[PDB]
């Protein structure tokens, strides 16, 4: 038994999202068919079912904007959420159950995003006073950035924090690392920032004081 | 109907018992949930009691009326995710907040650090000051702006990492977003972090 959520990553405010799961190893028309979504911060929300017959469920909360539909000739089955506000942004699972048991077989879920934003590179701005030194990328979107430092040949006593969306609906986050107070004056720092989505990639020394 | 799950974060050390509670709002279909990072939720235990298939022997599951209790008795690092009680008895069906497992190590004091905004920012009409707590324990830290001492608020942002796993401690970015015009309106910039590890407030400052 497998389960697979596919759909847009990203969609804009007031439009309606489509997400379709195509299941494998069993059929629709035996059991119970479930989405669950599961919010930033880990707070997971049941949203509904379409059973074995055809037959509906709804969460109350989602009632008013939700419908769950199926084509058993493909053994697919379908959420759409009408009306989306920035906080319809999560991961979307959709999930088997059996009856007496619970949610046995889960998909692997899928990131959506409500962003009203169009596809922008990051800026990248060094942070500069163990000493700590950093960069600063922001003003992009979608997700994900990645970072590193000199190359990739240092990793230890990286942090990459979790991006923040930020009120304007473009993302931040801050990549810092911690380093010997003695090696400030005579060794050298890059962050290396790739933004695939927007094919962004830029290199920035980190220049100090010392 | 409401599922209470306490607590919301739950330290343990490994090879110690680990118990997590679930009060429902009303009076039997309560399963429990495990998430482990970078996967799917899995089903650890069906009709209040009974251990699902695959599940181990240290994971099981009890409880009175309204009152369910998840214990897992040995605790192992496979074990370290977020846990959810589950009604499915009546509708609508309800999962409890989720109780995060995370490790137990000795309380660490953040090594605190304050940022300017560069040169290169400030041109393009933003300013963005960068607070790093590092390598810290517990998670619970409270980080307060301090702008020629009035304390900031509605315009900072943190993010945390989550539990390392080699020392088992966190670190915290706090970014305070300014434009360049209520940048220049003032001089000093302080962030006053607050946390167990530190017998009282520690501040971090530089003049604009
Ligand atoms: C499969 C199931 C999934 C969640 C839990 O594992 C329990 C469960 O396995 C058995 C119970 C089952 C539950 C899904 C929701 C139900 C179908 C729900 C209901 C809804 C409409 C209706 O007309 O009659 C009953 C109330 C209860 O009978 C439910």
């Known amino acids: 038994v497998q389960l ?9 405010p007031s439009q309606t999202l489509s997400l379709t799961c195509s299941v494998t ?3 629709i028309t035996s059991g119970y068919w479930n989405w669950i979504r599961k919010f930033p911060g880990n707070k997971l929300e049941y949203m509904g079912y379409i059973s074995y017959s055809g037959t509906t469920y709804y969460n109350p909360s989602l009632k008013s904007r939700i419908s769950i539909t199926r ?7 379908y959420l759409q959420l009408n009306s989306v506000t920035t906080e319809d942004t999560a991961t979307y699972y959709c999930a088997r159950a059996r009856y007496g048991y619970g949610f046995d077989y889960w998909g692997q879920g899928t990131t959506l995003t409500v962003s009203s934003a169009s596809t922008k590179g990051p800026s990248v701005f060094p942070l500069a006073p163990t000493a700590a030194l950093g960069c600063l990328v922001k003003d992009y979107f979608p997700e994900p ?3 590193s430092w000199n190359s990739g040949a240092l990793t230890s006593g ?5 991006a923040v969306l930020q009120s304007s609906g473009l993302y931040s986050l801050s990549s810092v690392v911690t380093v010997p107070s003695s090696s400030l004056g005579t060794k050298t720092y890059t962050c290396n920032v790739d933004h695939k989505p927007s094919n962004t990639k830029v290199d920035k020394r980190v220049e100090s004081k010392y | 109907v409401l599922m209470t799950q ?3 974060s739950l330290p343990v050390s490994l090879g110690d018992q680990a118990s997590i509670s679930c009060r429902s709002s009303q009076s039997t279909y309560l399963e429990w949930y495990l998430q482990k990072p970078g996967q799917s939720p899995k089903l650890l235990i069906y009709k209040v009691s009974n251990r699902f298939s695959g599940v181990p022997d240290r994971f099981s599951g009890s409880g009175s009326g309204t009152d369910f209790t998840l214990k897992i008795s040995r605790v192992e690092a496979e074990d370290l995710g977020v846990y959810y009680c589950f009604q499915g008895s009546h509708v609508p069906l309800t999962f409890g907040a989720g109780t995060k497992l995370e490790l137990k190590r000795t309380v660490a004091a953040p090594s605190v650090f304050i940022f300017p905004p560069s040169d290169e920012q400030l041109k393009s009409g933003t ?5 790093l707590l590092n390598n810290f324990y517990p998670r619970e830290a409270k980080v307060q702006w301090k702008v020629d001492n009035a304390l900031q608020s509605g315009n900072s942002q943190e993010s945390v990492t989550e539990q390392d796993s080699k020392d088992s401690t966190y670190s915290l970015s706090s970014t305070l977003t300014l434009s360049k015009a209520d940048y220049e309106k003032h001089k000093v910039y302080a962030c006053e972090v607050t946390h167990q590890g530190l017998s ?4 971090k400052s530089f003049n604009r």
Not at chain 1, 71 to 77: E, G, P, R
Not at chain 1, 158 to 162: K, L, N, Q, W
Not at chain 2, 127 to 131: E, N
């Open chain 1, 4 to 12: 697979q959520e596919s759909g847009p990553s990203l969609v804009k």
């Open chain 1, 25 to 27: 190893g069993d059929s």
């Open chain 1, 71 to 77: 084509d058993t000739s493909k053994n697919q089955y």
């Open chain 1, 145 to 147: 950035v990645t970072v």
């Open chain 1, 158 to 162: 990286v942090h990459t924090f979790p």
């Open chain 2, 6 to 8: 306490t607590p919301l």
């Open chain 2, 127 to 131: 300013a963005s000051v960068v607070c």
């Open chain 2, 200 to 203: 009282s407030p520690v501040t």
